[PDB]
CSV table of C-alpha atoms and ligand atoms in Angstrom, one decimal:
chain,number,residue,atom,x,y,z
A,9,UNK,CA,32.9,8.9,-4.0
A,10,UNK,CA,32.8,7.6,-0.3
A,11,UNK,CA,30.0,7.9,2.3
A,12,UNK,CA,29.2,10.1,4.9
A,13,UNK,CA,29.7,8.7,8.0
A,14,UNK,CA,25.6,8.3,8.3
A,15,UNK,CA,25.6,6.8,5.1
A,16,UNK,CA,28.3,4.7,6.9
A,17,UNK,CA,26.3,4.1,10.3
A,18,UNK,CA,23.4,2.7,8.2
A,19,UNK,CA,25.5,0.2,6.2
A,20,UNK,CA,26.6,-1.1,9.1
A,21,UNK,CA,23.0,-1.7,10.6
A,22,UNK,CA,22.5,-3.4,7.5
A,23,UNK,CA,25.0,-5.8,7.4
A,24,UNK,CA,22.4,-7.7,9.8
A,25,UNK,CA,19.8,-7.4,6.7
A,26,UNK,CA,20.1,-11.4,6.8
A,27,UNK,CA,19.3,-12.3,10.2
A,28,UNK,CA,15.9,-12.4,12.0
A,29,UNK,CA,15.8,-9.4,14.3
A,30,UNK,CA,17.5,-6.6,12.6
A,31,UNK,CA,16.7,-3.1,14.2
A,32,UNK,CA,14.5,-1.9,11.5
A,33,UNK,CA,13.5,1.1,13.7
A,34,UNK,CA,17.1,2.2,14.1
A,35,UNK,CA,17.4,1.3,9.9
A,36,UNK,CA,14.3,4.3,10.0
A,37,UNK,CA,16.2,6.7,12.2
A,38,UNK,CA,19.7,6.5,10.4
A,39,UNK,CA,18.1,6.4,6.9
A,40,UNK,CA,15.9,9.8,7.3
A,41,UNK,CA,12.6,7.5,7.5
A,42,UNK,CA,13.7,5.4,4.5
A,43,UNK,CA,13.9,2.2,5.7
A,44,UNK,CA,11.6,0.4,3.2
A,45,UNK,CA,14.0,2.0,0.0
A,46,UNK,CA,17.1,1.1,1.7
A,47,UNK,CA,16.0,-2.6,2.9
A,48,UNK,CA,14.6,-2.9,-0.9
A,49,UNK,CA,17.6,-2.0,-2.7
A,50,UNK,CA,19.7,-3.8,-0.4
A,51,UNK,CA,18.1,-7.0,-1.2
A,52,UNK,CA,17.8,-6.7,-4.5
A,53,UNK,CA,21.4,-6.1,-4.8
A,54,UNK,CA,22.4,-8.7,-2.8
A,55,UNK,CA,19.8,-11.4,-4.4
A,56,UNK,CA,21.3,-9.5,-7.6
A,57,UNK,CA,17.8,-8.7,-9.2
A,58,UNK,CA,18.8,-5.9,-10.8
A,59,UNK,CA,20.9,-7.9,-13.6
A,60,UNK,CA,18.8,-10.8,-13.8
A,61,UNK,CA,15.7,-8.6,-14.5
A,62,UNK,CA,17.9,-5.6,-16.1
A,63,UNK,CA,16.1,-3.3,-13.9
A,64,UNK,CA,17.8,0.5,-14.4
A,65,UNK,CA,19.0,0.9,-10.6
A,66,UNK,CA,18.0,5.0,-11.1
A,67,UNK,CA,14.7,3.5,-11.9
A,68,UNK,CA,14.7,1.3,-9.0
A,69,UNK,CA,15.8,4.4,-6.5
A,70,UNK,CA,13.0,6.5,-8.4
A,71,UNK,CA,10.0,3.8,-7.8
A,72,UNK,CA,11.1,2.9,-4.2
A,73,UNK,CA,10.9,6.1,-3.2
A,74,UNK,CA,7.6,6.7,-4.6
A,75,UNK,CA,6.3,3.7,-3.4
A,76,UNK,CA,7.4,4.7,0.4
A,77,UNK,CA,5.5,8.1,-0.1
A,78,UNK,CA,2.5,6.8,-0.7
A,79,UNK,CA,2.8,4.5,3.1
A,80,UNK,CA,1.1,7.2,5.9
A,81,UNK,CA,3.7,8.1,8.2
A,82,UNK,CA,0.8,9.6,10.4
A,83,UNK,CA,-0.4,5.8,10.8
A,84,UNK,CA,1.6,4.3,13.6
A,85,UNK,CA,1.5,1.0,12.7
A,86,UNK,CA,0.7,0.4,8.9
A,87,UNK,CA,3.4,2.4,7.2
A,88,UNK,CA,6.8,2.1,5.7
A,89,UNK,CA,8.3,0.8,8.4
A,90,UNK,CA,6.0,-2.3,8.6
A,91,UNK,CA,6.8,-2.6,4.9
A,92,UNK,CA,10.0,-2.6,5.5
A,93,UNK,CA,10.2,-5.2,8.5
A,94,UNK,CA,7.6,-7.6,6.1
A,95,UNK,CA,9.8,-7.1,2.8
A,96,UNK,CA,13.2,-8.0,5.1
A,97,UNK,CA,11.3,-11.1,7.4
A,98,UNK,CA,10.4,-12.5,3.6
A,99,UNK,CA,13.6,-12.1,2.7
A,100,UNK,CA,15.0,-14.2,5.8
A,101,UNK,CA,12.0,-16.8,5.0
A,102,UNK,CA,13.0,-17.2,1.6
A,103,UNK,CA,16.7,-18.4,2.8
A,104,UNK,CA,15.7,-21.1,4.9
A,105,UNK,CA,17.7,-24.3,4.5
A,106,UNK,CA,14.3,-26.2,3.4
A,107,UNK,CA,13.5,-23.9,0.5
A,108,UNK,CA,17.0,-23.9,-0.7
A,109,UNK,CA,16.9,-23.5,-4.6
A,110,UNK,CA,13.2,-24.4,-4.9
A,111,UNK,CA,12.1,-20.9,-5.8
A,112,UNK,CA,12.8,-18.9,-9.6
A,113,UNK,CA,14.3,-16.1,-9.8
A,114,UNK,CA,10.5,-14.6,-10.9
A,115,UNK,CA,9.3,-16.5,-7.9
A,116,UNK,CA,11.6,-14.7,-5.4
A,117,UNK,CA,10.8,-11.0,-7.2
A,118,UNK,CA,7.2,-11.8,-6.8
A,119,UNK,CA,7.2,-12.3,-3.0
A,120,UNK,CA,9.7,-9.7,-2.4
A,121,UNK,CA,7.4,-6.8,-4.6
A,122,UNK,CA,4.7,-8.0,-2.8
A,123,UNK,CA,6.0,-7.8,0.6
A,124,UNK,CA,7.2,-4.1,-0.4
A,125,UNK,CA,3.6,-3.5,-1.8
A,126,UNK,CA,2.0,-5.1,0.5
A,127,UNK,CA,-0.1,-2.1,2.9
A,128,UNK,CA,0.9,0.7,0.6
A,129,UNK,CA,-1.6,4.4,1.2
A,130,UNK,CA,-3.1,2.0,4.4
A,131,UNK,CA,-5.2,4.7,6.1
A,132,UNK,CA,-5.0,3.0,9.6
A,133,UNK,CA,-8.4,1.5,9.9
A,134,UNK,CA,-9.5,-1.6,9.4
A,135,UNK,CA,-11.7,-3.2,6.3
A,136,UNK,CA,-14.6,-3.2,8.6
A,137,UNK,CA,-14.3,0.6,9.8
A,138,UNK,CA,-14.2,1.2,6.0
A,139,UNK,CA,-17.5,-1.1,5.1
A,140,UNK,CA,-19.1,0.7,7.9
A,141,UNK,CA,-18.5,4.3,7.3
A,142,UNK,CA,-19.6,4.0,3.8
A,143,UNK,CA,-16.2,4.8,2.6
A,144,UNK,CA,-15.1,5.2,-0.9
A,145,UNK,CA,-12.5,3.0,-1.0
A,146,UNK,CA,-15.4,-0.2,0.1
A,147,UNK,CA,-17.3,1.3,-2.3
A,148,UNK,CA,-14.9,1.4,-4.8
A,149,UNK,CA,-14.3,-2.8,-4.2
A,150,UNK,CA,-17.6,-3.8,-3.4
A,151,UNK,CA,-17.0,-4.5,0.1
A,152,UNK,CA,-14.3,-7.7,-0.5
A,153,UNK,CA,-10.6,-7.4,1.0
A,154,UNK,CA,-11.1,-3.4,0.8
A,155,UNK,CA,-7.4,-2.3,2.1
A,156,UNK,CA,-6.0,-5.8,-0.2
A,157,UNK,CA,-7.1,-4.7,-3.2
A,158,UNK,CA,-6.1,-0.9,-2.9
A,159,UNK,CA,-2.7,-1.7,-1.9
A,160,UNK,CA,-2.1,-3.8,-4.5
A,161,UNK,CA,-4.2,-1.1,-6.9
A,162,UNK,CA,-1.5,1.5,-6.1
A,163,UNK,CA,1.4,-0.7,-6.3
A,164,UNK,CA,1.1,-1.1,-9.0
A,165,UNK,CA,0.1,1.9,-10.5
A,166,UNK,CA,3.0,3.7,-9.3
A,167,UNK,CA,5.1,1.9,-11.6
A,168,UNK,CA,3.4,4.7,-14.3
A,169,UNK,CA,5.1,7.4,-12.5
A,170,UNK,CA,8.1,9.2,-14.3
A,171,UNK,CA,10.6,6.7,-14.4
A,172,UNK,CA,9.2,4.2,-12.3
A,173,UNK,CA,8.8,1.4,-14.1
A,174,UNK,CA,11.4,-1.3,-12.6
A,175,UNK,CA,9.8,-3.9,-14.8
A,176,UNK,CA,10.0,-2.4,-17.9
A,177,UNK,CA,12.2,-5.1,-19.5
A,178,UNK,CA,10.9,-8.4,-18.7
A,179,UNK,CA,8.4,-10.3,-21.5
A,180,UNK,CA,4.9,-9.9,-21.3
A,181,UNK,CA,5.0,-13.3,-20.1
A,182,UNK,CA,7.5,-12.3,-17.2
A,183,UNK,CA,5.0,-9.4,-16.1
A,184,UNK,CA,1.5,-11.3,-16.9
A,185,UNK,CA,3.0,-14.3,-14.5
A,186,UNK,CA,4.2,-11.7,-11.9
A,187,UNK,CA,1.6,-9.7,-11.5
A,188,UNK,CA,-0.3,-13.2,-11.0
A,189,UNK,CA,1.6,-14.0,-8.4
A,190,UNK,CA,2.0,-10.5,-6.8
A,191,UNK,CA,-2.2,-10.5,-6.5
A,192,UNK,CA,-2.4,-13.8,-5.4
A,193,UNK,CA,0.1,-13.1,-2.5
A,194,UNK,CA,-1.2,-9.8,-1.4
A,195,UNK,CA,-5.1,-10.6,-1.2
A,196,UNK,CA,-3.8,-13.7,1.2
A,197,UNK,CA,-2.8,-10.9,3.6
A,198,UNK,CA,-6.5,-10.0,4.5
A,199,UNK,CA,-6.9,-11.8,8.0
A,200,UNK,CA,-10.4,-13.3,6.6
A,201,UNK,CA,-8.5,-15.9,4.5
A,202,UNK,CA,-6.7,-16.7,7.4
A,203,UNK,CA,-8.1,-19.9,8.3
A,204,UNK,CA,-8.4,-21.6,5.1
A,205,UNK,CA,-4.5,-20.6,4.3
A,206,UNK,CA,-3.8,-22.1,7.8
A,207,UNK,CA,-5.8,-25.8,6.9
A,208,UNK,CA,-4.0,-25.6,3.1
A,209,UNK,CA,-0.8,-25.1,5.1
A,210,UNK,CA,-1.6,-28.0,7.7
A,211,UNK,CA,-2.7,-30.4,4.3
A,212,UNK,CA,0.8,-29.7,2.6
A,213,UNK,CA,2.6,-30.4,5.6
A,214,UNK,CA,0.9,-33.9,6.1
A,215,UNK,CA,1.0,-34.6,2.5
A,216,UNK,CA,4.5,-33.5,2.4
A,217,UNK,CA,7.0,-34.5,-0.2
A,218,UNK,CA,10.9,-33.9,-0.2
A,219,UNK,CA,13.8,-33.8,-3.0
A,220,UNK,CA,17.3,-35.1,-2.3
A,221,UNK,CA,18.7,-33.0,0.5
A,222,UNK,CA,15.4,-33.2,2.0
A,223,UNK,CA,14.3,-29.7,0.6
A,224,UNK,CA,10.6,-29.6,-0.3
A,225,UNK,CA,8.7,-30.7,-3.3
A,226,UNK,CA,6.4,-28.2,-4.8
A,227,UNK,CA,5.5,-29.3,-8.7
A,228,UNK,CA,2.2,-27.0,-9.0
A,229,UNK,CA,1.3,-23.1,-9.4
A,230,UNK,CA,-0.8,-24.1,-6.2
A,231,UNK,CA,1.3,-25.8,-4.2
A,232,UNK,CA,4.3,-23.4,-5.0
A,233,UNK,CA,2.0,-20.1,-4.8
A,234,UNK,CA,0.3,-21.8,-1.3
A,235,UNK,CA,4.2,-21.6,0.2
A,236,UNK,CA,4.9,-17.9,-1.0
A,237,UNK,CA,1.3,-16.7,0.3
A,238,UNK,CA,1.8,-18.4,3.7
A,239,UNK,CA,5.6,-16.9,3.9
A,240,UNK,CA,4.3,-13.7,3.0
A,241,UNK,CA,1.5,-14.1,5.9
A,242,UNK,CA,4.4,-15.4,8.4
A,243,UNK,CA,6.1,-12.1,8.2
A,244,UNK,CA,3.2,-10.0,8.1
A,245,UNK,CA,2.5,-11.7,11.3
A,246,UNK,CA,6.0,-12.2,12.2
A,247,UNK,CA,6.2,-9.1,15.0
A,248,UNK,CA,5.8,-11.7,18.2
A,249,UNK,CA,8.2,-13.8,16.8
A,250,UNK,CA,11.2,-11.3,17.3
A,251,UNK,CA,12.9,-10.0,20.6
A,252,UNK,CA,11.1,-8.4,22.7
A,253,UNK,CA,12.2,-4.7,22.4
A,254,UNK,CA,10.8,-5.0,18.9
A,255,UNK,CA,7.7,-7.0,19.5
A,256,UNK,CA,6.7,-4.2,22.2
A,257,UNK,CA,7.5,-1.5,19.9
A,258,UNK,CA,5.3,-2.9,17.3
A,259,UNK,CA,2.6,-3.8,20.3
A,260,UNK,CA,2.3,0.1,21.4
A,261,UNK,CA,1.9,1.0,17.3
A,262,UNK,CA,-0.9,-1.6,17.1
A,263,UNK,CA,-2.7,-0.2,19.7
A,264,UNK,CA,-2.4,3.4,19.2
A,265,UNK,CA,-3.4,2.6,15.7
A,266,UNK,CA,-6.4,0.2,17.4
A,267,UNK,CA,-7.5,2.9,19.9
A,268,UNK,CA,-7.4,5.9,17.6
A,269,UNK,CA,-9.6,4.1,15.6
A,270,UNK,CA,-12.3,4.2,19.0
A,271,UNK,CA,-12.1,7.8,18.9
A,272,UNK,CA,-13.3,7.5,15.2
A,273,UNK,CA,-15.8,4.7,16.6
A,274,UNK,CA,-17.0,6.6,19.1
A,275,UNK,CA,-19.2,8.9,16.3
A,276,UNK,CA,-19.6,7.0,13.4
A,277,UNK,CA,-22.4,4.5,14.1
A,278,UNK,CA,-20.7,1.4,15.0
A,279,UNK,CA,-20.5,0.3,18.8
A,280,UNK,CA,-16.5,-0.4,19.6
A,281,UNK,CA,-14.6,-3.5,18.7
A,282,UNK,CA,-13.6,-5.8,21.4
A,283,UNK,CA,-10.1,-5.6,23.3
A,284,UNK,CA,-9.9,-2.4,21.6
A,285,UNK,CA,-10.1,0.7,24.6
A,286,UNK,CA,-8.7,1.3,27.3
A,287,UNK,CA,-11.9,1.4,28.9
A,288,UNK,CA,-11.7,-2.2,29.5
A,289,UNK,CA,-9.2,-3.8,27.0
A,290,UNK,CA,-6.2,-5.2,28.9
A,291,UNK,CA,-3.4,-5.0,25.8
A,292,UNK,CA,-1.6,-7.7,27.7
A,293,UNK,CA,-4.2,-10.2,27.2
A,294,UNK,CA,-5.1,-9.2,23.5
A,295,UNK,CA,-1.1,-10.3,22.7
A,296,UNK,CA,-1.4,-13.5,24.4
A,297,UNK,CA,-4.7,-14.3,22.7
A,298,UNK,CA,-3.4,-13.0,19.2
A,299,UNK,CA,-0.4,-15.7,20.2
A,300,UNK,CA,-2.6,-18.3,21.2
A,301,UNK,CA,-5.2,-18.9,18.4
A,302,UNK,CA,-3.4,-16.8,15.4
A,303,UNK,CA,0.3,-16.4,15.5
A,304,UNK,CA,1.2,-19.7,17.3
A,305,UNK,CA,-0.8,-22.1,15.4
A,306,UNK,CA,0.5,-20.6,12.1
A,307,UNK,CA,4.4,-20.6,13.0
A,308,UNK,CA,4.1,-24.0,14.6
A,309,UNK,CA,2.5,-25.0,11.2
A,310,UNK,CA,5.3,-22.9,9.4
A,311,UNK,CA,7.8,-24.9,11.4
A,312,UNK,CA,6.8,-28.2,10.6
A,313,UNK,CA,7.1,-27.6,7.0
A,314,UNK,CA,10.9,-26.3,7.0
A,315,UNK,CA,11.5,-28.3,10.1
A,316,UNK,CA,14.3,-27.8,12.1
A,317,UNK,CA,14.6,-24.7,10.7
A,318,UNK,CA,12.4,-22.2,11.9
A,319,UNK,CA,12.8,-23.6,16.0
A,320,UNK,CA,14.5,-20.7,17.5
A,321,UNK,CA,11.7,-18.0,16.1
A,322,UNK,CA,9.3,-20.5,17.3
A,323,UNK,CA,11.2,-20.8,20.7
A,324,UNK,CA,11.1,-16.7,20.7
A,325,UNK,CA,7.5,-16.6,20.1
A,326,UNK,CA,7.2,-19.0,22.7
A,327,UNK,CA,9.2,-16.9,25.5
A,328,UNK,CA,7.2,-13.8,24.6
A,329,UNK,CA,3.9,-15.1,25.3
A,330,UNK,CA,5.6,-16.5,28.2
A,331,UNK,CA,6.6,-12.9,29.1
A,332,UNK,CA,3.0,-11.3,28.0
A,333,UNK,CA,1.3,-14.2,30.1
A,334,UNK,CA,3.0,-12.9,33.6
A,335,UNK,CA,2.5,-9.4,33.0
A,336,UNK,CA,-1.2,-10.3,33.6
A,337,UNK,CA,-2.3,-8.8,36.7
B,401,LIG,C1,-6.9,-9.7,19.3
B,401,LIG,O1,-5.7,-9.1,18.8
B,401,LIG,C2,-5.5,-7.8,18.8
B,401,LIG,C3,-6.6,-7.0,19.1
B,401,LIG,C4,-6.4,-5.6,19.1
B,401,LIG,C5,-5.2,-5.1,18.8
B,401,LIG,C6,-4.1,-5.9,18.5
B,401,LIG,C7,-4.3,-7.3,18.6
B,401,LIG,C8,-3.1,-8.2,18.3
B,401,LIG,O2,-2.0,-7.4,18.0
B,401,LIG,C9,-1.6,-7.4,16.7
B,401,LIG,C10,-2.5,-7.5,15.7
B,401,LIG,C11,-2.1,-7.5,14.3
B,401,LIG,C12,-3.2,-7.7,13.4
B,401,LIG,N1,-4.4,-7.8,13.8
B,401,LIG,N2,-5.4,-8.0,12.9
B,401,LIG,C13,-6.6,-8.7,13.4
B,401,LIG,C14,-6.2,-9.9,14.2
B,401,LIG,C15,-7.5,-10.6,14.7
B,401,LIG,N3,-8.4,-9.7,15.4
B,401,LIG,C16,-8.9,-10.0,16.6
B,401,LIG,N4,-10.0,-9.3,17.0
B,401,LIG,C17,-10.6,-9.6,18.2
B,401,LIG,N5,-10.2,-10.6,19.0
B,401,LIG,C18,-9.1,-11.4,18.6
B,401,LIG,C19,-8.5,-12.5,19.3
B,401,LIG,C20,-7.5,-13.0,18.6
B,401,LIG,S1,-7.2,-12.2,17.1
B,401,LIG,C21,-8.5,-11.1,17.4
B,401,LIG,C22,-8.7,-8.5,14.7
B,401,LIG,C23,-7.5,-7.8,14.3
B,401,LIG,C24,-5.3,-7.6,11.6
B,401,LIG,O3,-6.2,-7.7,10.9
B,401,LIG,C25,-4.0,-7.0,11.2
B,401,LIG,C26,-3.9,-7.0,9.7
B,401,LIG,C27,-3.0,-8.1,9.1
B,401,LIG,C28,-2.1,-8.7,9.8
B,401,LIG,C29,-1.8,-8.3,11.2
B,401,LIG,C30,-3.0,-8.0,11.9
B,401,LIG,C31,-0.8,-7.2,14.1
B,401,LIG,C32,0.1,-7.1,15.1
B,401,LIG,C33,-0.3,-7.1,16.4
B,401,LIG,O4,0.5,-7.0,17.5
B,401,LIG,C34,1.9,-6.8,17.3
B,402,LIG,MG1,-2.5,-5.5,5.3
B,403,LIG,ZN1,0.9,-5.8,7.0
């Protein structure tokens, strides 16, 4: 009735399951490549979602499981290990002293499921490889967030598997304002919606309204699901924000991800795309650049709306591209 001592080794790791910066590739190693089921159930127990939604925990096991199988661990960078480092920066996000009992219970379930779901059966090319290559899946969505909506397609219909289906007993209005939320969150992960969630973001933050003890104000299904979309967005682009080790790490998974997608380029029509071979594509530059006009100007914004708390990540991101800058020969 006691662990193994590996079983042991990994609750230890995750006793850092609240802080930014936890070693989610060592959570990988000492969980047998199940860091996405082991970060899940962790939270959930510890957010106790398993009684407030009465969710069987053999059920929760069962789905997690299945939903981790169907992330490629031949793709180097979009698999359950992204999940699981998206699913636990959301986590962190959703403690922040600003947000502090603003969120339901439903609300919190709904980010957290779609941070988990988030890149599920990601092939490791992009939506514009797949438009290009006449690829079913493109075909199968007409072209529009291609990799969004299949994610989100599967996620949800693994919950049909045998014993899968952790919401099983919550009202049809429970699920029908879930799944809601779950779509809405996940299709705001396609880069191309980037910009406009940005500019919503800056609006709230100069229109911004606070509660007594300064928390924020969010009184709308827009305003409220505009927050969890942009948190959601944060982690998913939350890999220069951490130490270094892990931000390089997640670096060298991008670009062998990037670059194996040349040698795919290389035959099927298509020219290259830019900063992406290492026949003239300095990786060192790409990272500052990806700092400069995406990550930076969304965390800064991120910032401002839970100011002061989010200034050390901030300060991080702020050191790495620093450190990425110098490397520049
Ligand atoms: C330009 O940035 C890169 C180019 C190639 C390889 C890697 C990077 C940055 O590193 C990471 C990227 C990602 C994600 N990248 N993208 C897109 C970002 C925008 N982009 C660009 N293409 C060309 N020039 C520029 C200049 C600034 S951005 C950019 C295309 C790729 C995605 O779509 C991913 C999917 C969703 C979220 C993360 C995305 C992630 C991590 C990186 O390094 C750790
Ligand atoms: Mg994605
Ligand atoms: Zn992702």
């Amino acid at each position: 009735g006691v662990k193994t001592e590996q079983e042991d080794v990994l609750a230890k790791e995750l006793e850092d399951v609240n802080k930014w910066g936890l070693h989610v590739f060592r959570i990988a190693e000492l969980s047998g490549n199940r860091p996405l089921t082991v970060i899940m159930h962790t939270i959930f127990q510890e957010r106790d979602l398993l009684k407030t939604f009465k969710i069987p925990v053999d059920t929760l096991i069962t789905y997690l499981m299945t939903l981790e199988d169907h992330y490629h661990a031949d793709v180097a960078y979009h698999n359950n290990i992204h999940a699981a480092d998206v699913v636990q920066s959301t986590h962190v996000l959703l403690s922040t002293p600003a947000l502090e009992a603003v969120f339901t219970d439903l609300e919190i379930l709904a980010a957290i499921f779609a941070s988990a779901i988030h890149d599920v059966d990601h092939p490791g090319v992009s939506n514009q490889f797949l438009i290009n290559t006449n690829s079913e899946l493109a075909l199968m969505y007409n072209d529009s967030s291609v990799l969004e909506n299949h994610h989100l397609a599967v996620g949800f219909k693994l919950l049909q598997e045998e014993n899968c289906d952790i919401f099983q007993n919550l009202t049809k209005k429970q699920r029908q304002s879930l799944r809601k939320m779950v779509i809405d969150i996940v299709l705001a992960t396609d880069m191309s919606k980037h910009m406009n969630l940005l500019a919503d973001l800056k609006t709230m933050v100069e229109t911004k309204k606070v509660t007594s003890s300064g928390v924020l104000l969010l009184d709308n299904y827009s305003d409220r699901i505009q927050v969890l979309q942009n948190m959601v967005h944060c982690a998913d682009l939350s890999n220069p924000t951490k130490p270094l080790q892990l931000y390089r790490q997640w670096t060298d998974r991008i670009m062998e991800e990037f670059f194996r997608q040349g040698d795919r380029e290389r035959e099927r029509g298509m020219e290259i795309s830019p900063m992406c071979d290492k026949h003239n594509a300095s990786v060192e530059k790409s990272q500052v650049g990806f700092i400069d006009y995406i990550v930076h100007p969304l965390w800064e914004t991120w910032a401002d709306l839970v100011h002061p708390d989010a200034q050390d990540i901030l300060d991080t991101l702020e050191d790495n591209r620093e450190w990425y800058q110098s490397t520049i020969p």
